């Protein structure tokens, strides 16, 4: 909430959604997201 | 600060203060007039400023001293809507009392009941404080000269002499000097005319401002009658002072 | 693990340094105290006798604590409304112990980065060991310590982290030849009463502001010292009329009296000057102005 | 909070912030106190005027509800007078219709207390601004003394105080109170305790002191009937007060 | 605090000295302890006493980790908690975080909360492990459970919760006994008196009276500590608590 | 000179993060002083706009 | 008395045997000339001037205020004699806080380190502090008792014959035929601040320049004071403060 | 017998009586002890006025021998106030002793500014006037002048007051 | 939050107002009622005590609502006051109407209905007061009940409300025997009250007490409040004093 990390989370997440979709819509490399809830993440992911 | 508080009169602060009520002690200086009520030994005088700032108004109608009943006068400082509204309650309670108990209502009992009624308006939250100071004057049928000032919260205390309005502090100081210096609690004249003259002088001293009959209005409660002096009646008084 | 010297070209260890330099300063001002008249020996000695038994005494003499067989004391808490001389009691004792007085302030430890403040705190306890016996003092704990814990922002958590670090070291896991940390606050509402806690931090001394004529006499004995006022003007007539006054109000009284002397272009202070002062820098006299419906 | 605009919902920590704030409001008021004796009750409070021109001589702060039951307050000045008005009326209703004369001390206290309860019972109405002390005498329970809190609860006490200097007056009273005290002796404790409140403004004419003591068939207002008891309440005069402050 | 001495021995020493017995007889292994209750009870010192007898590593980690940067950052020293614990096993780790951060960030979410969320959560991963358990005895300390975060609180990936009591009359007496030997033993025996007079609210109060009593003797300049010294000493500390709550019988419900 | 929104080159509040728009703010004073480089400000006049 | 004499001569206070008085709280309404009056005293001595808003050091960055006051005082020691003008102590005013949002807690930090910095510890040599504020009603008790401090100066609205002196200063600047009508003007100009009197000269001269004369006549002074009085209470609320 | 019944003002005095007994046997270690014993047990300070006047006097005598004479003075002044403003029934005798003692401590500090404050016509040359007051001031001035020859003249005639 | 009024429910259908009102009872002192074969004993605890406080004029948590049924009180006392009076009036309304005294179950049922009614309709507050009703009626002989601030009742052979509810409950039931002598009922009450209470010395002035018996003065339900001097004695038998 000060400094030293205002950028890092923002770049890192966005960059994750992008290369999952950009492969192609494959059924040969599966991903698993393990998460406490969707209330600790963004309200849209990438999104059904 | 503010977090609810001031939006209501049934909300206290951490301090227990009811803020909205304090705003009416700031709302009673909104007419910009100042009053002086003084005691003699057969009268009470009450004097307020008369502002006729546009000549589009009739200087006659202008006043804030209202006759409440035979023996009771009252000066209002603060708003014209709340002036009339407080006068309605006062006129009405004075008449009802007269007929309930068969006998006239003292300065103190009118002062007492107006405050209680106001208190109930602070207890409840469909009403609000009437933001006026009312200063009742009567010469009592049993306690002689009296002044009771009623404050917008609904405190009441008597007085020897009192001042109200924004410029109150200078008038307080003058009046302190006067009674201290005499060591008696009243003006010493037994002629009510010179007491009105004396009240006038004090008022000019305290404010620093010389007056005219267009800048005064004077109420005089004597024993068993009340009268408000007209403009030419005041005028007579001023020319006694200026050349004694 | 400590500081060390490497040579510039070899980039190899040739010499060693104290760990006492390369950190933050041991004393922010001068090591010896500024006031050498004192207003701590002159002013509240009684209250000062409590402070000294805990702080000066164990470092000067080990033999004293040994005799009972009790170990060196726990921390000292200074609290009571402002104008009680706590800033000046702590250093007046320290200088005469011949410690060298950490202070620094706990307002230093706050920082705008992350993880660096709690680091400063850990740094200070080891540092105090390296120059020990030493008197450890943090000037405020009025913001380190709190009314309510919070972490809605990350910036609340930082405060909370410094709090933790105080206590954790103020057990001591590597002992202290120091008296344990001395702390100062204004009140106990900005203290967690759960976490300070006897044990720990055990001597807790409240300074009064309400006083007694004896407490206030001392403040005048200090003033009679610095300016020995005429044998004609009566010092003791000023005392009897004081009923509820702080040592800071008293400080101003003498400042204002000898200001009127500079004005009259004299070189003495008279009993007139005291009465003028006696009226004023007292405040109040404004709660009667429109209020009387709260009585 | 979110329970301190509410006159309705309790907290999960109990009560209303509004009561708690009412207790504060009480503590902004002047120091009042009452001390119970084995043959009396003395009641004392102070008067400030906020202008030497003011005349609070006409104002009463020690006020008789019934001839046998007086009361004081600490807290808001206007709230007291109305609550008192209603006290007397409810007093005539509740036992001056049953025995046709003034109620026991116990009966009036609980009823006055009932009025406070109604201004808490209903939201949108704030509690009354004041806490009272009510001292009276009845024959079935003797001399008694009470605190009636705006909360709607009441407590009996040997001696107590309320107002700004309350916490200092409370300790004074503990020590100096004895198993047997005379009327003169509570008057003597009372003065010393009130003088803590203000000094350089302390004279017994600015201090209102009255009693609930013994019958007075002099201030009864009639005579020639010895088969009645006169008012247990009495106001002592300015000179009589002055006498006790001269004596101390 | 006898109850606590017996438990922490059964829970920590027995799986480390012999892992075979616990697996044969029961199933699984405990992942640690969550110590909670009043502060002053000497959780830490007790735990240091455990670390010494088992012949285990120590460390002790003081607070949240970000603070060390001399090489790397403190976010990754949590990752290295595994590497270090394992190589130098057998270990006990007394992981501190009192959680005066509070319940504010038990709910939270938002703020700068995500870093300390991460430090706490990822620590959790190394213990239970994804194969191999590094150490089975990482150990949590905190004042309450309501201030404790739910990943860590939730049992079965941290095991055992043990609550310290505010001390009994019996406990006070036994704490009083061990320090008074070090001091001076009162003539007539007035060690019995102290525990009757008041029971502290923590075990820090019992120790804090003992240091105070021998303070009283000292000032007078007397080697021995009397009945009298103990009598002022209990009184001075009781007075502090009594200050706090006193207006809960005047202007109260 | 017509100067657009002053809600971003010279905020009243510093609870906005600014470090170079902090330096723009200091230069806005220097401009007003320099219009007195001919006497008064008649020749080189400045108008300015803000939306709050 | 408090600032100018002991800095110029410490010596007279050594003779009186007291310590020098330090610390002034100046408070009053905006446009009452508190900057003017603070600036004026120092400028005589030749003393350096530091004007630091106390809301320009409050950022979201926690400890940002602490750091800025730390350097500020240490620079002043070199620039002795110097008076630091703490402009607004009502943006760091009050004591309670130490809870809720991080801005509330930023106030305490600024306050607590200053207390020692006044106090002489630290050590104000020929540095003196003059404190200016709008609100002494919300101020810290620690930073507003006695002995921070020697005189509490309440500066009201400009006096009935104080405004007359402000008209003298301003009416001097302009080219005029000579005007003697300020008597009525000042009476029109009740409740005004020196900022509004300043405006009145400038306005009175704009009318002269609209009428194509280079001279301020009595006709135009009268216009300035009526029109300012109107537009002052229209965009004002007539704010109440000590 | 009454430590399990200690709360009385009666035994505050009993602790004061130890200070007196141990003062005369000339050991101050155990007077200062019993002085604290009285003070702690006299946290019931709204119990009688006499007790409080003895308590201050006893403190003063000890600190006077501790050689702290500014501390000596403050308790001594306070003892004085008690007697003078309390009713007279024997308090006159006690008031006089304490006025000598005020003078006593201040002459040790060798300050004559404040000795001369104490000497006034409102209680030191009016309500109480005594030969021992005049002895004290004769010594005071003699000390300051640094003439042992002025000390010598005084002591022969005022020995009675001294002793 | 959904604690704004009684009308409004959370997602889960609980109402926070009820919850707060339970917690209100345990911020005032322990209260214990024990039923025994030979009488039902009531005992309660003083949350207040000052050194100048008196408590000899009245018990502030014990009222007889009828000459056969009496209640011990836990909660805020102003709230308590209103309801104590409502119950006692309703009791005698029964006496007027039927010329016999009210059965226990009706009396409890009436007050929980009134209390629920404040939740069901309007703006009015719920009133968090827990009464322990100890009564005798020919339906089930001695009967000991308590009323919830949730506005329903449950029968009992022992119950504790007020401070330390968990602590009081296990201790009472451990030393419960189905029978129980009225003297042992008294002895037990005092012992559980000392442990719960943070005042080390349980004195008679920290105690309120009544014992209710039809085994004493047969054919008549007789409720008797002990005086201080009787309470003072029993403490010496239990060895507290
Ligand atoms: N020990 C003392 N007793 C009496 N007066 C003192 C004492 N020490 C210093 N003083 C006087 O009191 C003045 C104000 O005290 P000081 O600033 O030391 O207070 P504090 O209680 O530490 O304050 P803060 O809460 O503002 O940190 C000093 O300027 C000095 O004149
Ligand atoms: N059971 C005991 N026997 C002896 N001493 C005890 C005992 N328990 C606590 N103490 C003493 O009480 C003091 C306070 O305990 P300590 O600071 O070690 O507590 P903690 O509860 O682990 O604290 P934190 O929450 O700050 O981590 C110490 O001086 C300790 O030695
Ligand atoms: N009393 C006065 N005498 C002269 N000019 C004044 C006076 N008060 C205010 N001014 C004018 O108002 C302008 C702004 O007021 P300033 O000095 O910044 O006040 P403050 O510090 O009270 O907010 C000044 O630059 C000056 O033109
Ligand atoms: Mg300080
Ligand atoms: Mg620990
Ligand atoms: Mg300015």
* Nearest protein Cα to ligand 1, atom 12: C248
Closest by Cα among F32, F34, F36, F8 to F22 = F8
According to DSSP, the β-strands at D54-55 and B156-159 are: antiparallel
Tokens, residue G68: 């800025």
Burial label, C205 (beta-carbon count in 10 A; 0-12, 13-18, 19+): middle
- The residues with which E36 forms a beta bridge, in sequence order, are E163
Tell me the two tokens of residue G159: 């006096």
Task: Return the partners of chain G (3 or more C-beta pairs < 8 Å).
Answer: A, C, F
Question: Per the CB < 8 Å rule, is E244 touching C118?
Answer: no
End-to-end CA distance of chain G: 23
Place of tokens 């969707």: A38
Q: Is C87 annotated as a binding residue?
A: yes
Residues of chain D with C-beta less than 8 angstroms from the C-beta of I58: 106, 156
Task: Name every chain E residue with its beta carbon within 8 A of the beta carbon of I53.
Answer: 249
- Shortest distance, CA D210 to any CA of chain B (angstroms): 20
Q: Are C205 and C51 in contact (CB under 8 A)?
A: yes
Q: Compute the distance between CA of residue B219 and CA of residue B226 in angstroms, rounded to an integer.
A: 8
Q: Which two tokens stand for residue H36?
A: 């604290």
- Which residues of C are less than 8 Å from E225 in CB distance? 68
The answer to whether B154 and B94 are in contact (CB under 8 A) is: no
Nearest ligand, CA of residue C142? 1
The two tokens of residue E113 are: 């909360």
The C-alpha atoms of residue D216 and residue D236 are separated, in whole angstroms, by 12
Measure the CA–CA gap between C30 and C91, rounded to whole angstroms: 11
User: Strand I207-213 and strand I222-225: pairing?
Assistant: antiparallel
Given a contact cutoff of 8 angstroms between Cβ atoms, the answer to whether C5 and C17 are in contact is: yes
Q: How many residues in chain E?
A: 253
DSSP D87: H
Rounded Cα–Cα distance for residues B2 and B22 (Å): 14
Tokens for B43? Answer: 């009268």
Could you tell me if G118 and G23 are in contact, meaning their C-beta atoms sit under 8 angstroms apart? yes
CA I77 to chain CA mean position, Å? 13
DSSP state of C266: -
CA C150 – CA D76 distance, rounded (Å)? 37
Is I160 in contact with I144 (CB distance < 8 Å)? no
CA distance B78 to H154: 79
CA–CA separation, I231 vs G236, rounded Å? 72
Would you call I34 helix, strand, or coil by DSSP?
strand
Subunits with at least 3 CB pairs below 8 A relative to chain H? C, D, E
**∠ CA I228-I230-I233, rounded to 5°:** 110
Which residue in chain G has the smallest CA separation from F15? Answer: G59
Cβ neighbours around C37 below 10 Å, total: 12
SS3 D66: strand
Q: Does any ligand 1 atom lie closer than 6 A to the CB of residue C84?
A: yes
* C284, C264 Cβ separation under 8 angstroms: no
Kind of pairing between the strands at G48-53 and G24-27: unpaired
What's the farthest any 2 CA atoms get from each other in chain C?
A: 83
- Measured from the Cβ of residue B201, the count of other Cβ atoms closer than 10 Å reads 13
Nearest chain D alpha carbon to H9: D175
Cα G4 to chain centroid, rounded: 17
Give the closest residue to C233 by CA, choosing from C257, C215, C217: C257
Tell me if chain F has a CB within 8 Å of the CB of G188: no
Structural element, H or E, at residue B14: none
Q: How far apart are CA B190 and CA E133, in angstroms?
A: 107
Spatial contact of D131 and D26, defined as CB atoms under 8 Å apart? yes
- Asked if D166 lies within 8 A of E250 by C-beta distance, the reply is yes
Q: Are the beta carbons of I34 and I168 closer than 8 angstroms?
A: no
* CA distance linking residue D143 with residue I57, whole number of Å: 11
What the block records as the tokens of F48 is: 């300015």
Question: What's the CA gap between F35 and F41, in Å, rounded?
Answer: 5
**Cα four-point dihedral sign D204, D205, D208, D212:** positive
CA distance C279 to G233: 38
CA atoms within 13 A on the CB side of E248: 10
Residues 6+ apart with CB under 8 A from D239: none
**Is C293's CB within 8 Å of B155's CB?**
yes
Contact call for B17 and D25, based on CB within 8 A? yes
Beta carbons within 10 angstroms of residue C8's beta carbon: 6
Strand partners, I141: I137
- Collect all residues with Cβ–Cβ distance below 8 Å to I135 and sequence separation of at least 6: I68, I69, I70, I103, I104, I107, I142, I143, I145
Is G touching A (3+ C-beta pairs, cut-off 8 A)?
A: yes
User: Is B4 at the interface with chain D, CB within 8 A?
Assistant: yes
Residues 6 or more apart whose CB falls under 8 angstroms from that of I17 comprise D9, D10, I3, I5, I6, I119, I126
CA I46 to chain centre: 13
CB-CB contact of I35 with I158 (8 Å): yes
Other beta carbons within 10 Å of I36: 26
How far is Cα E157 from Cα E154, in angstroms, rounded to an integer?
Answer: 7
Residue nearest to atom 8 of ligand 1 (CA): C85
Chain centroid, CA A25 distance in Å: 16
**Residues at CB less than 6 angstroms from ligand 3:** G 30-36, 158, 166, 193-195, 198
Shortest CA distance to D64 belongs to which of D124, D119, D137? D137
The rounded distance, in Å, linking the Cα atoms of B166 and E11 is: 78
Burial class (CB in 10 A: 0-12, 13-18, 19+), B187: buried
Q: In this structure, what DSSP letter does residue D204 have?
A: T
Residues 54-113 of I with CB under 8 A from E: 76-78
Give the residue among G225, G242, G235, G238 at the shortest CA–CA distance from G166: G225
Residue C221: CB partners within 8 Å, gap ≥ 6? Answer: C42, C43, H70
Find, among I58, I57, I52, I54, the residue nearest to I44 by Cα. Answer: I58
Instruction: Give, for C51, the enclosing helix (H) or strand (E).
Output: helix C45-55
> Is G31 one of the annotated binding-site residues?
yes
Method: cryo-EM
Q: How far apart are CA B150 and CA B68, in angstroms?
A: 15
- Quick one: which of C161, I42, C99 has its CA closest to E65? C161
- Token pair, residue E77, equals 């020293």
CA atoms within 13 A on the CB side of A27: 0
Most C CBs within 10 Å, among H39, H45, H66, H70, to test the C interface: H70
Nearest-10 Cα torsion for E107, E112, E114, E117: -70
Q: List, in sequence order, every residue forming a beta bridge with E91; answer none if it has no partner.
A: E57
Q: Are B70 and B94 in contact (CB under 8 A)?
A: no
Q: Count other C-beta atoms under 10 Å from residue H125's C-beta.
A: 12
- Termini Cα distance of chain H: 39
The rounded distance, in Å, linking the Cα atoms of D136 and D105 is 5
Q: Which stretches of I24-103 are DSSP H helices?
A: 77-98
CB atoms within 10 A of CB C177: 13
Q: Is the dihedral of CA G48, G51, G57, G58 positive or negative?
A: positive
User: Which residues are CB-neighbours of I178 under 8 A, at least 6 positions away?
Assistant: none
Ligand 3 pocket test, pick from G89, G133, G155, G194 with the greatest ligand atom count within 8 Å of Cβ, gives G194
Residues β-bridged to residue B75 = B65, B135
Say how far apart CA D218 and CA D211 lie, in whole Å.
15
Nearest Cα of chain E lies from the Cα of H4 at a distance, in angstroms, of 12
Collapse the DSSP code of I40 into the 3-class scheme (helix H, G, I; strand E, B; otherwise coil) and give the result: strand
Inter-residue contact G103 to C143 (CB < 8 Å): no
Query: Ligand 1 pocket, C88 CB below 6 A?
Result: yes
Encoded tokens for I43: 């005992």
Q: Which residue in C49, C210, C216, C217 has the most chain H C-beta atoms within 10 A of its own C-beta, making it the best mutation to test that interface?
A: C217
Using a CB–CB cutoff of 8 Å, tell me whether H4 touches chain E. no
DSSP three-state, residue B77: strand
DSSP string, chain G: --SHHHHH-SHHHHHHTSPPP--EEEE--TTSSHHHHHHHHHHHHT-EEEEEESSSS--SSTTHHHHHHHHHHHHHHHT-SEEEEEE-SSSS--S--SSSSHHHHHHHHHHHHHHHHHHSSS--SSEEEEEEES-SSS--SSSSSTTS-SEEEE--S--TTTHHHHHHHHHHHS-BS----HHHHHHHTTT--HHHHHHHHHHHHHHHHHTT-SSB-HHHHHHHHHHHHHHHHHS-------
Whole-Å CA distances, D236 to B110, D47, D160, D210: 28, 15, 21, 5
Q: Helix E169-182 and helix E203-220: axis angle, to 10°? A: 40
Query: Is the separation of the CB atoms in I73 and I63 below 8 Å?
Result: yes
What distance in Å separates the CA atoms of residue C114 and residue C153, rounded to the nearest whole number?
A: 13
User: Which chains neighbour E (Cβ–Cβ under 8 Å, 3 or more pairs)?
Assistant: A, C, D, H, I
DSSP E strand boundaries for chain E: 32-36, 93-94, 138-141, 161-163
Q: Is the CB of E180 under 6 A from ligand 2?
A: no
With vertex at residue C258, the alpha carbon angle to CA C257 and CA C260, rounded to the nearest 5 degrees, is 70
CA D239 vs. chain centroid, Å, equals: 22
DSSP state of C72: P
Write out D144-203 in H/E/C secondary structure: EEEEECCCCCEEEECEEEECCCHHHHHHHHHHHCCCCCCHHHHHHHHHHHHHHHCCCCCC
Q: Whose CA is nearest to atom 17 of ligand 3?
A: G33
């Amino acid at each position: 909430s000060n400094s030293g990390g205002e950028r890092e989370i923002q770049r890192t997440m966005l960059e994750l959604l992008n290369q999952l979709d950009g492969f192609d819509d494959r059924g040969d490399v599966k991903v698993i997201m393990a998460t406490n809830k969707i209330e600790t993440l963004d309200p849209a992911l990438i999104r059904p | 600060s503010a977090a609810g508080y001031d939006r209501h009169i049934t909300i206290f602060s951490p301090e227990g203060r009811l803020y909205q009520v304090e705003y009416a002690f700031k709302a009673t200086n909104q007419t910009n007039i100042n009053s002086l009520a003084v005691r003699g030994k057969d009268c009470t005088v009450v004097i307020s400023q008369k502002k006729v700032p546009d000549k589009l108004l009739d200087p006659t109608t202008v006043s804030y001293i209202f006759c409440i009943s035979r023996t009771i006068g009252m000066v209002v400082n603060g708003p014209i809507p709340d002036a009339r509204n407080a006068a309605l309650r006062a006129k009405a309670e004075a008449a009802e009392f007269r007929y309930k108990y068969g006998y006239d209502m003292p300065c103190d009992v009118l002062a007492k009941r107006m405050a209680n009624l106001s208190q109930i308006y602070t207890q409840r939250a469909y009403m609000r404080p009437l933001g006026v100071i009312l200063t009742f004057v009567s010469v009592d049928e049993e306690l002689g000269p009296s002044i009771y000032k009623t404050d917008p919260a609904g405190y009441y205390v008597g007085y020897k002499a009192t001042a109200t309005g924004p410029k109150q502090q200078e008038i307080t100081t003058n009046l302190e000097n006067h009674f201290k210096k005499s060591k008696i609690d009243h003006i010493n004249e037994e002629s009510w005319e010179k007491v009105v003259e004396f009240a006038i002088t004090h008022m000019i001293d305290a404010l620093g401002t010389e007056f005219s009959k267009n800048d005064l209005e004077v109420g005089v409660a004597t024993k068993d009658k009340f009268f408000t002096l007209s403009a030419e009646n005041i005028e007579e008084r001023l020319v006694a002072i200026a050349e004694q | 693990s400590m500081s060390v010297a490497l040579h510039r070209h070899s980039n190899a260890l040739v010499d060693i340094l104290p760990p006492d330099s390369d950190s933050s300063i041991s004393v922010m001002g001068e090591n010896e105290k500024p006031d050498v008249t004192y207003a701590d020996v002159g002013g509240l000695d009684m209250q000062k006798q409590e402070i000294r038994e805990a702080v000066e005494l164990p470092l000067v003499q080990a033999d004293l604590y040994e005799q009972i067989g009790i170990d060196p004391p726990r921390g000292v808490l200074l609290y009571g409304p402002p104008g009680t001389g706590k800033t000046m009691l702590v250093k007046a004792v320290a200088n005469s112990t011949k410690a060298a007085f950490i202070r620094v302030n706990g307002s230093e430890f706050v920082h705008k980065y992350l993880g660096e403040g709690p680091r400063m705190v850990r740094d200070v306890f080891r540092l105090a060991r390296e120059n020990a016996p030493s008197i450890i003092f943090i000037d405020e704990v009025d913001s380190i310590a709190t009314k309510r814990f919070d972490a809605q922002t990350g910036s609340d958590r930082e405060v909370q982290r410094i709090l933790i670090e105080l206590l954790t070291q103020m057990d001591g896991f590597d002992q202290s030849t120091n008296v344990k940390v001395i702390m100062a606050t204004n009140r106990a509402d900005t203290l967690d009463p759960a976490l300070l806690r006897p044990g720990r931090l055990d001597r807790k001394i409240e300074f009064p502001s309400l006083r007694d004529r004896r407490e206030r006499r001392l403040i005048f004995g200090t003033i009679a010292s610095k300016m020995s006022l005429a044998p004609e003007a009566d010092l003791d007539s000023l005392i009897i009329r004081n009923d509820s006054l702080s040592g800071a109000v008293i400080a101003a009284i003498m400042q204002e009296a000898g200001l009127r002397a500079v004005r009259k272009n004299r070189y003495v202070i008279l009993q007139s000057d005291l009465e003028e002062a006696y009226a004023t820098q007292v405040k109040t006299d404004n709660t009667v102005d429109k209020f009387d419906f709260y009585k | 909070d979110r329970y301190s605009f509410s006159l309705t919902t309790f907290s999960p920590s109990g009560k209303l912030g509004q009561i708690d704030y009412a207790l504060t409001a009480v503590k902004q008021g002047v120091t009042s106190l009452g001390i119970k004796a084995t043959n009396g009750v003395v009641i004392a409070t102070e008067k400030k005027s906020s202008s030497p021109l003011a005349m609070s001589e006409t104002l009463s702060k020690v006020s008789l509800l019934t001839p046998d039951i007086g009361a004081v307050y600490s807290g808001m000045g206007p709230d007291y007078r109305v609550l008192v008005d209603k006290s007397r009326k409810v007093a005539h209703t509740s036992y001056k219709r049953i025995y046709g004369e003034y109620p026991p001390t116990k009966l009036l206290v609980s009823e006055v207390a009932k009025i406070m309860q109604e201004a808490t019972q209903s939201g949108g109405v704030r509690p009354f601004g004041v806490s009272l002390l009510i001292a009276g005498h009845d024959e079935f329970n003797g001399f008694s003394l009470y605190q009636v809190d705006p909360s709607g609860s009441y407590f009996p006490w040997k001696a107590t105080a309320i107002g700004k200097g309350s916490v200092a007056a409370k300790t004074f009273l503990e020590k100096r109170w004895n198993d047997e005290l005379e009327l003169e002796d509570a008057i003597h404790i009372a003065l010393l305790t009130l003088k803590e409140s203000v000094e350089g403004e302390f004279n017994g004419d600015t201090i209102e002191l009255a009693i609930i003591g013994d019958e007075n068939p002099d201030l009864l207002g009639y005579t020639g009937i010895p088969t009645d008891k006169g008012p247990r309440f009495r106001k002592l005069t300015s000179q009589e007060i002055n006498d006790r402050l001269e004596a101390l | 605090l006898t109850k606590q001495i017996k438990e922490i021995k059964e829970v920590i020493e027995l799986p480390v000295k012999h892992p075979e017995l616990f697996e044969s007889l029961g199933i699984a292994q405990p992942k640690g302890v969550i110590l909670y209750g009043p502060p002053g009870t000497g959780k830490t010192l007790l735990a240091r006493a455990v670390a010494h007898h088992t012949d285990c590593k120590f460390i002790r980690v003081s607070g949240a980790e970000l603070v060390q940067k001399y090489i790397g950052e403190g976010s990754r020293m949590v990752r290295e908690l595994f590497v270090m614990a394992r190589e130098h096993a057998p270990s006990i780790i007394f992981m501190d975080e009192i959680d005066s951060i509070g319940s504010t960030r038990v709910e939270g979410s938002g703020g700068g909360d995500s870093e300390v969320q991460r430090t706490m959560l990822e620590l959790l991963n190394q213990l239970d492990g994804f194969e191999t358990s590094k150490n089975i005895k990482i150990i949590m300390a905190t004042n309450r459970l309501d201030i404790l975060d739910p990943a860590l609180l939730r049992p079965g990936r941290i095991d055992r919760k043990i609550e310290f009591p505010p001390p009994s009359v019996a406990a006070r007496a036994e704490i009083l006994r061990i320090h008074s030997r070090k001091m001076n033993l009162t003539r007539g025996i007035n060690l019995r008196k102290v525990a009757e007079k008041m029971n502290g609210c923590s075990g820090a109060d019992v120790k804090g009276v003992c240091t105070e009593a021998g303070m009283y003797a000292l000032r007078e300049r007397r080697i021995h500590v009397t009945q009298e010294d103990f009598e002022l000493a209990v009184g001075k500390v009781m007075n502090k608590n009594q200050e706090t709550a006193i207006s809960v019988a005047k202007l109260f419900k | 000179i017509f100067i657009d929104e002053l809600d971003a080159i010279g905020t009243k509040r510093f609870d906005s993060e600014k470090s170079g728009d902090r330096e723009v703010q200091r230069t806005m004073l220097e401009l007003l002083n320099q219009l007195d480089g001919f006497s008064s400000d008649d020749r080189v006049k400045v108008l300015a706009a803000t939306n709050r | 008395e408090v600032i100018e004499l002991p800095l110029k001569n410490p010596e007279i206070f050594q003779r009186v045997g007291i310590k020098p008085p330090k610390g002034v709280l100046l408070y009053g309404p905006p446009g009452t000339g508190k900057t003017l009056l603070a600036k004026a005293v120092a400028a005589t001595i030749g003393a350096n001037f530091i004007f630091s808003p106390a809301s320009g050091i409050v950022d979201k960055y926690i400890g940002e205020s602490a750091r800025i006051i730390r350097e500020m005082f240490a620079y002043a020691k070199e620039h002795e004699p110097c008076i630091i003008f703490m402009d607004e102590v009502d943006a760091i005013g009050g004591r309670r806080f130490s809870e809720g949002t991080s801005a509330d807690r930023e106030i305490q930090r600024t306050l607590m380190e200053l207390l020692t910095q006044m106090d002489g510890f630290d050590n104000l040599g020929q540095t003196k502090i003059i404190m200016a504020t709008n609100r002494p009603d919300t101020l810290d008790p620690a930073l507003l008792r006695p002995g921070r401090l020697d005189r509490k100066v309440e500066i009201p609205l400009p006096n009935e014959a104080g405004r007359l002196e402000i008209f003298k200063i301003h009416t001097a600047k302009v080219k005029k035929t000579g005007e003697f009508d300020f008597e009525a003007a000042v009476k029109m100009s009740d409740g005004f601040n020196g900022a509004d009197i300043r405006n009145c000269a400038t306005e009175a001269g704009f009318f002269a320049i609209r009428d194509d004369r280079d001279h301020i006549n009595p006709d135009d002074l009268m216009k300035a004071v009526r029109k300012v009085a109107e537009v002052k209470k229209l965009e004002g609320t007539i704010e109440y403060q000590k | 017998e009454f430590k399990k019944l200690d709360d009385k003002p009666s035994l505050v005095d009993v602790h004061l009586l130890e200070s007196k007994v141990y003062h005369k046997l000339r050991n101050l270690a155990k007077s200062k002890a019993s002085l604290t014993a009285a003070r702690t047990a006299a946290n019931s300070i709204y119990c009688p006025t006499q007790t409080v006047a003895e308590l201050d006097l006893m403190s003063g005598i000890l600190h006077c021998e501790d050689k702290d004479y500014k501390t000596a003075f403050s308790y001594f002044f306070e003892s004085f106030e008690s007697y003078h403003n309390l009713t007279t029934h024997n308090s006159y005798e006690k008031a006089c002793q304490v006025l000598k003692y005020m003078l006593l401590s201040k002459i040790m500090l060798n300050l004559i500014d404040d000795v001369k404050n104490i000497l006034n016509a409102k209680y030191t040359k009016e309500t109480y006037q005594s030969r021992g007051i005049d002895a004290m001031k004769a010594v005071a001035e003699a000390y300051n002048n640094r003439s042992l020859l002025d000390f010598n003249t005084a002591l022969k005639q005022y020995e009675k007051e001294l002793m | 939050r959904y604690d704004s009024r009684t009308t409004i429910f959370s997602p889960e259908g609980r109402l926070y107002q009820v919850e707060y009102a339970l917690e209100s009872i345990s911020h005032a002192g322990t209260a214990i009622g024990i039923m025994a074969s030979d009488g039902i004993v009531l005992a309660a605890e003083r949350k207040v005590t000052s050194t100048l406080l008196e408590q000899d004029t009245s018990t502030e948590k014990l009222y007889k609502l009828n000459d056969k049924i009496a209640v011990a009180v836990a909660g805020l006392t102003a709230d308590a006051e209103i309801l104590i009076n409502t119950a006692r009036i309703h009791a005698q309304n029964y006496l007027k109407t039927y010329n016999e005294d009210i059965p226990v179950e009706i009396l409890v049922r009436r007050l929980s209905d009134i209390k629920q009614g404040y939740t069901q309709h309007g703006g009015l507050r719920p009133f968090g007061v827990s009464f322990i009703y100890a009564g005798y009626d020919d339906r089930y002989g001695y009967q000991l009940y308590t009323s919830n601030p949730s506005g329903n009742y449950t029968g009992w052979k022992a119950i504790s409300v007020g401070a330390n509810t968990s602590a009081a409950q296990t201790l009472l039931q451990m030393d419960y025997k189905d029978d129980m002598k009225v003297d042992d009922a008294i002895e037990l009450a005092l012992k559980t009250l000392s442990k719960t209470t943070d005042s080390s010395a349980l004195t008679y002035d920290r105690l309120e007490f009544a014992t209710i018996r039809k085994g004493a003065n047969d054919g008549e339900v007789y409720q008797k409040i002990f005086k201080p001097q009787e309470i003072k004695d029993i403490l010496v038998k239990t060895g507290i004093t």
